[PDB]
Amino acid sequence: DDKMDETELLRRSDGPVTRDRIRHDLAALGLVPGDTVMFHTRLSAIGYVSGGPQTVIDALLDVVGPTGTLLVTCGWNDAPPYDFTDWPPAWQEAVRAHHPAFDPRTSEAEHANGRLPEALRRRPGAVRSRHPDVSLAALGASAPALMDAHPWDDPHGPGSPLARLVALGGRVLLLGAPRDTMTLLHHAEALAQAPGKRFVTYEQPIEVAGERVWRTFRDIDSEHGAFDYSSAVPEGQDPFAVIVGSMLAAGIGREGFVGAARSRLFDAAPAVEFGVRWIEEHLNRD
Amino acid sequence: DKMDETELLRRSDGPVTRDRIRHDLAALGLVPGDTVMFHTRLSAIGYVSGGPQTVIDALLDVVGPTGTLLVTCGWNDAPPYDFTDWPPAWQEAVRAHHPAFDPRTSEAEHANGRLPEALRRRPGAVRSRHPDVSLAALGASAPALMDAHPWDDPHGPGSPLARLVALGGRVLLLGAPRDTMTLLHHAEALAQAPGKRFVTYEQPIEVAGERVWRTFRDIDSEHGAFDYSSAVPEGQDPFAVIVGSMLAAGIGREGFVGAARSRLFDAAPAVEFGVRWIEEHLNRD
Ligand SMILES: [Cl-]
């Protein structure tokens, strides 16, 4: 029921949530002109947002202003599965012969990231990074250098957009999104040194020189965790949720509300520094 | 989700590729130069390698550069028709702050699925200007089909749907159920019968760079342009009944595209049939 969904969201926020009200709530959280902010969104948690994703994006642009930048994690919803080489031989041949290349302009973001990354990447002037598995998108003053030349291998590591967010003094905003959605902690996993690090190898079709070619990629296991967190994390619990919870308890990050959405704003450099130290201390046992 | 893939892969007995869809579309009767409005239920096709992009590429492969694809978009985040029933403070917030419809960025209705949202993002795609029932089109006839969508009676004469009929266009249901045929709203707008139901609603648009509120009139495309209670059996959707009767009268062809039950109609005889069906069932002189 469409009617119903609207009724519940209106009730949740006690009426429509507007662009200027979101702008006000974001400034109260600590977002300021000139910031670069990567943001994860659970749109319905805000309430009934008058104008949907476009209103959230324009409120964010109002706060950071023309010299600031917004960033999201996109990925590729219709990528071939990592394990597509475990299918009957005629099937995977069909994939290898006919699966289209990743295309930054048209390939849709992963559906699990919700509507906001797919709205951001389609904004006029938005820039989407070239990686077929873990592309980001950005909008604003620093968007070309942040997204430029996404490193094929180790795409969460030293050369990556996430590293550039840290070096810029950027921020991470969870906008109703839960603590485990903080993508930036994959950059922490990529930097962290501890035994038992998990890596993945997969292939995906990309377009280079205007022709479609397959490429093999290496990354940390950003799906099941770059380590076994068995010893440091109660089972049933998500490692990133535990790290961010400890982060917050150590005084890194500010919590508040944007509409009806429980929201958290972090500086990216201390969050990554905390995350790598968390992983190395819990997992090295020296 | 690996089981999700196993379900889809079992449904189509392996990946459905661009070439396989093109093959099945041609066998259903789509030809080079066709203009085709299509409604899609991706999961009914099976495991489509490449998702919506692959469906669109296959359709372009069949109709070629002289052909045109059309979809219905609408506007997912339009103000609800009845926001003017809300408490005064809530409707004043919508009036002062709801952003204008923007054909380049306003999202299609979530219920229309992922194909319309992918089509309108293609390079060269054209999206009509109507804030409530916009269409999008891609190909040689897209500018003329989408141009100057009438504000009032947006399914009536001179609308994109009327232009699809006049062009000799077609309608494709690609695993979509018989009741998503948008073209039959054009039949409802043309049909002469008692008790026709209309809606009047307000939506923000941009006119010469300024955001303005406008009032719009349409047939009730949400609840049905007529009370169909005496014309259809209980629990059946009117458009499904009309399309079923259309098929049984020899209008339209049916087959499979991948695993998806699919139906292809010529738009001019579909609308003529739909108008007659409504006038015969709802006048009963
Ligand atoms: Cl490049």
Strand segments (E) across chain B: 35-40, 68-72, 126-127, 135-139, 170-174, 198-207, 210-219, 253-257, 260-266
Helix (H) or strand (E) holding A7: helix A2-13
Exposed, middle or buried by CB within 10 Å (0-12, 13-18, 19+), for B43? middle
Q: Which of B245, B132, B9 is nearest to A80 (CA)?
A: B9
Experimental method for this entry? X-ray
Cβ–Cβ of A108/B114 closer than 8 Å? Answer: yes
| Contact between A172 and A247 (Cβ < 8 Å) | no
Cβ–Cβ of B15/A95 closer than 8 Å? Answer: yes
Q: At what angle do helices B267-283 and B238-248 cross, to 10 degrees?
A: 120
Closest residue in B to A115 (Cα–Cα): B107
| Contact between B213 and B202 (Cβ < 8 Å) | yes
Name the minimum distance, in Å, from the CA of B14 to any CA of chain A: 6
Distance CA B75, CA B60 (A): 25
Distance CA B240, CA A37 (A): 49
Using CB atoms, which residue from A99, A115, A123 is nearest to B50? A99
Three-state secondary structure call for residue A121: helix
| Contact between A268 and A165 (Cβ < 8 Å) | yes
Structure tokens, B169: 């266009």
DSSP string, B189-244: HH---TT--EEEEEEEEEETTEEEEEEEEEE-TTT-SS--TTTS-TT--HHHHHHH
Cβ–Cβ of B93/A51 closer than 8 Å? Answer: no
Contact of A212 with chain B, judged by CB distance below 8 Å, is answered with: no
Query: In degrees rounded to 5, what are phi and psi of residue A127?
Result: -125, 130
Helix (H) or strand (E) holding A204: strand A199-208
Contact list in B for residue A80 (CB cut-off 8 A) is 49
Contact of B129 with chain A, judged by CB distance below 8 Å, is answered with: no
Cβ–Cβ of A100/B57 closer than 8 Å? Answer: yes
Contact list in A for residue B76 (CB cut-off 8 A) is 52
Pairing of strands A199-208, A211-220: antiparallel
